[PDB]
């Protein structure tokens, strides 16, 4: 198994700059047996740059790859929006046929903190017995987001659940939702529900809290 | 000219098996190699097998071998991935590619196929609505939002005002809890325009055709 390893695994770029990841082997292979493919959310892994340097039909000339024996790497002259995605490595040398990790490369942008919202349970839901308390953080950069759960100033890592939007298509910004569920009963059994969330916008953790009514 | 088409999504219970399909056009797969890749998640692409339309002759990943089956049926230029004694980790996108004879013009790969294990039943969505407790979030405006839980299979669409308001909205992707997927969407609007102007979340869940509609106080 040759193993490829893609570097770095994120980055950020802004338009107009010049961007390079790199794609090592664990042992040589045919320049001619390397690939990039490119793959946007929802659509299928893209044929970009084959036998290492020669580029598909319907690929930018901003674009360029290079290297032989086991060091690669693709090479963007000057980064525009559509080229914010993943790109992978393969090598079709010696099977198993292996991919790298891939480089998700992002549209880079000014720093942004994020605007909190927690929101406690719904009557409606309270009916049923069951009581989530929802925490919004919206439009916020770099990605890089430390969320707490507070609950009467007690740290609380049971019941949540974290999701993260992908960059903003218009203002490359990131949103992230976090739900912290628990019953009637040892929800109405606590007063004080606290969001808590450091980002590299702040050393001082934003805090969003309310009290039962 | 030349184009792979796969067979459709599939939902299937756990311990059951399925076989997909990939069939080719503008071109014969018996001049090629036929090849099943697999993509879980947020994870990477992974390949799994090989083979060689003209023979049979087929290469697997020993991690799959077992598990998968790659076959091929040259007369109706068709290609196969049978998966057996399916659990939660197969679930994944499957995509079918093709070695091209010639690399420089062509996609070689198909669109792909999802398959996902569950032994859930279709299961409408509880729709809570999201009103803030009195509390400055920010300067003026204000932030709405509504909890989609318990709901199965995926997906749901969350319109706000019916479509009038599909501004300064987040809709957060799924999350797996407790084998039934839960999502949460917030809108942002001016503070001027709330509580003026009432605003309701339309949830619609296809699987179940249920539309909830909940207005917020």
């Known amino acids: 198994d040759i193993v490829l390893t893609q570097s770095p695994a994120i980055m950020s770029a802004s338009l107009g700059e010049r961007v390079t990841m790199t794609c090592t082997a664990s042992?040589?292979?045919?320049?001619?047996?390397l690939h990039w493919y490119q793959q946007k959310p929802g659509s299928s892994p893209k044929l970009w740059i084959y036998?290492?340097?020669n580029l598909a039909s319907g690929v930018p000339a901003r674009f360029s790859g290079s290297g032989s024996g086991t060091s690669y790497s693709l090479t963007i002259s000057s980064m525009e929006a559509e080229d914010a995605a993943t790109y992978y490595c393969?090598?079709?040398?010696?099977?198993?046929?292996?991919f790298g990790g891939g480089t998700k490369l992002e549209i880079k942008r000014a720093d942004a903190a994020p605007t909190v919202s927690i929101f406690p349970p719904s009557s409606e839901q309270l009916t049923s017995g069951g009581a989530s308390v929802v925490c919004f953080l919206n439009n916020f950069y770099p990605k890089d987001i430390n969320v707490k759960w507070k609950i009467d100033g007690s740290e609380r890592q049971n019941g949540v659940l974290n999701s993260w939007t992908d960059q903003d298509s218009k203002d490359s910004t990131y949103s992230m939702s976090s739900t912290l569920t628990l019953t009637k009963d040892e929800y109405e059994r606590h007063n004080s529900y606290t969001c808590e969330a450091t980002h590299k916008t702040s050393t001082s953790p934003i805090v969003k809290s309310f009290n039962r009514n | 000219e030349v184009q792979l088409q796969q067979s459709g999504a599939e939902l299937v219970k756990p311990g059951a098996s399925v076989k997909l399909s990939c069939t080719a056009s503008?071109?014969?797969?018996?001049?090629?190699?036929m090849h099943w890749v697999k993509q879980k998640p947020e994870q990477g692409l992974e390949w799994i097998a090989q083979?060689?339309?003209?023979?049979?002759?087929?290469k697997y990943d020993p991690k799959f071998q077992g598990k998968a089956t790659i076959t091929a049926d040259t007369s109706s230029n068709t290609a196969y991935l049978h998966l057996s004694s399916l659990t939660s980790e197969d679930s994944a996108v499957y995509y079918c590619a093709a070695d091209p004879p010639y690399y420089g013009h062509g996609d070689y790969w198909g669109q792909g196929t999802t398959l996902t294990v569950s032994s859930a039943k279709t299961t409408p969505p509880s729709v809570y609505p999201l009103a803030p407790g009195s509390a400055a979030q920010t300067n003026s405006m204000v932030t709405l939002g509504c909890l989609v839980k318990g709901y199965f299979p995926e997906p749901v669409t969350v319109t706000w005002n019916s479509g009038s308001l599909s501004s300064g909205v987040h809709t957060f992707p799924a999350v797996l809890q407790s084998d039934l997927y839960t999502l949460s969407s917030s809108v942002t609007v001016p503070s001027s325009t709330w509580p003026s102007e009432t605003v309701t979340c339309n949830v619609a869940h296809p699987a179940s055709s249920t539309k909830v509609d909940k207005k917020i106080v």
């Open positions: 042992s040589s292979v045919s320049s001619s047996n």
């Open positions: 036998s290492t340097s």
């Open positions: 503008g071109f014969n797969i018996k001049d090629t190699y």
């Open positions: 083979i060689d339309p003209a023979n049979g002759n087929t």
């Open positions: 393969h090598q079709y040398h010696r099977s198993p046929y292996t």
